[PDB]
């Protein structure tokens, strides 16, 4: 028989209970229960299926919760200190019992209400440079990492980013939502030959370059914290990919916070983006140097080749992830909040400028300041 | 446990057991090495080949690759693998068409055979194969299947290893005649060559962009005037288009290095006519059988042939040296006579294999590859 029953208040705290208070569900979703539960304290995170499920929403199974149970304990095995301790996981029921926390604010919230956060850069630069080398060819014996390519295999997660991030921004395809305004942008998109043929190169880059374990979804909302934390939640959609991912999407939602703010504004989110390029560049050398498995690893210019291809990788998906937020399904507050309405679609125009020339120029840059410079330019 | 070790009645018990005969035949073991069984089974008033794994240590999984990597081939080119009648992973067992009447294309070409149509033929399996199990062809969550079906981790071990690794170092597995040490050591302290050698063997490590053959030289190819078949895809696993295309065309210019003067030129119209087709195949799949949006924007078929070319010729560089220098040779270099002849066409090898490593991206046809070839080995 299925041990699977979607839980309550009272089922959750009596879960909790046979894994030796009061509860209140505080979830932002409609594909997952998140309960809080208080003595200490805990939060225990249960997937929704389809099915209901309450409003629409992209039809998935609960093997998600899996993933990202699995995920997160992996990422503790290497940055205890920047993902939530995982007490207790069960594939069937769906549920990560994971630790607390609540006394930090979602990034994306923080940056929006003009938080400036600033060690943000300096952790999840670690995350990514721990998280991204730990779990590859570099660090691994090609026959465990093979075998991790296989339980981490997440076609349907996959399946979102695919469409979302890598095609349907770049056709009239039914999941974009866009103002009408933004209308002539957008077909100056669609009629660029050059810059889809460079998104159908970075999107085969996604489906097929089994690099390493990565998030899959690293925006500002999936990142808590204060002036002093940073905790990196819910790795629901990792899988083997390119490890220039994660670092391009991240990148892109410091770019657009920084769209969403005025003039000296959006200085830190700037010095953010190359303080987090900086910072995963020294990790990601500094664990190569120290782990890294192969004979080449010590080759003058090998790690500097390998850091410029994960660059350039970085800045292409970055680009795609500044499009995609904008007219694609899933927006960003960042820019969907933006007032007067008109200066909202002028910002939303150089999302979309900046990540054509992000895709187009990515293998041009040299530095991350190039990156940056050639923004500030743009958005002038 | 279920295994156990086929004989010759052993063999001929199974064949009827399956109702492939009927009831007189008689059965001979004829396999070439000492890691599989190969029984070929006659019926007077009908023949067949049942290959067994036995138990370089390796598991007997690599049969379940085999039947399974030969099964899909069929799919797109049967009349370029043999049929597959019956397999069992337990057992380890494929059973498969008689291609007796039949030569090792390698043997033959070593003999002095030319097989007009060996090329044509070869490049029709590496497009359709190469087009038909990836991202372009197949819908993506089908294919990531494949990709956990066709894992192969103690044979792709092997590639990593003898391929892209030990040849480049002073590695216990590597095996060389003393007179070529001076070249081997020109290589093994060349830096940029190695660091290039490196990026090859990282494509082959994460590249996983179709099912390959993983092991396509031609001691696994059966040939004569007018038929080609492509055997023993036990390497098979989800890797980059290029490799099988370049292992091809290496062991092309291997058999071109045995030869001398106007003998090698059937070698170098076979190199240039498994490009042709090879590309003329995998852009009408392309054409015909694209899933993608992005298939028909102009540009974009060129960009991916163009990437392909370059991995294939960078990954036909380090067979041309690991087989020259690494623990598995090639008969076409170590029976050249005389000694001295045999060194310095082994010589060129490592020397054109170090070239093509390191120019794979200057290329811009199949034309520079050979051209190159041709001015190095005057
Ligand atoms: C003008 C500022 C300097 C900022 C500063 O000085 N502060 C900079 C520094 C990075 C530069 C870009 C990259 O190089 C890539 C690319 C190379 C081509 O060649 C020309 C175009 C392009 C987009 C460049 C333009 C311009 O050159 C940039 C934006
Ligand atoms: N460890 C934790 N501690 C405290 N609150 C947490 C928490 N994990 C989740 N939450 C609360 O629940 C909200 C939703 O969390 P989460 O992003 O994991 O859910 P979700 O996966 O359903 C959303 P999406 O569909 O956007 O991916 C958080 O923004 C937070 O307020
Ligand atoms: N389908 C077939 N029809 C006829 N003979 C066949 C055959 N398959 C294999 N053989 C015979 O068996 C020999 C060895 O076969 P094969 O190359 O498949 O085995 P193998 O995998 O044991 C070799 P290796 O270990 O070197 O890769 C061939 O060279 C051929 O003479
Ligand atoms: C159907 S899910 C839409 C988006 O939300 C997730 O966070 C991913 O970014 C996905 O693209
Ligand atoms: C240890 S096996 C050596 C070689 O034989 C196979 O045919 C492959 O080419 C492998 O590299
Ligand atoms: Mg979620
Ligand atoms: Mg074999």
Redesign the interface.
Known sequence: TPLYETLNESSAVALAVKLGLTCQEIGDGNLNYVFHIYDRALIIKQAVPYAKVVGESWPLTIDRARIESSALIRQGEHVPHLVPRVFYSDTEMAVTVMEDLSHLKIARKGLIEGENYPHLSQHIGEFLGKTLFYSS?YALE??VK??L??QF?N??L??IT?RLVF?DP??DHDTNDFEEELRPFVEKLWNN??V??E???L??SF?????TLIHGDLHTGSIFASEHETKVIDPEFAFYGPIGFDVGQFIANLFLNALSRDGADREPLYEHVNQVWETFEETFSEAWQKDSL???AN????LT?TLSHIFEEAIGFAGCELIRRTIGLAHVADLDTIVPFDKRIGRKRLALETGTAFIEKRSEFKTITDVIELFKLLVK
Request: aromatic share 10%; proline share 5%.
């Open positions: 060819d090609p026959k093979k075998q390519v296989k295999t076609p349907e996959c399946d695919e095609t770049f056709f030959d050059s889809k043929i998104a159908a190169k999107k085969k489906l097929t370059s089994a690099e192969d004979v080449y080759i003058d210019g090998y080749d």
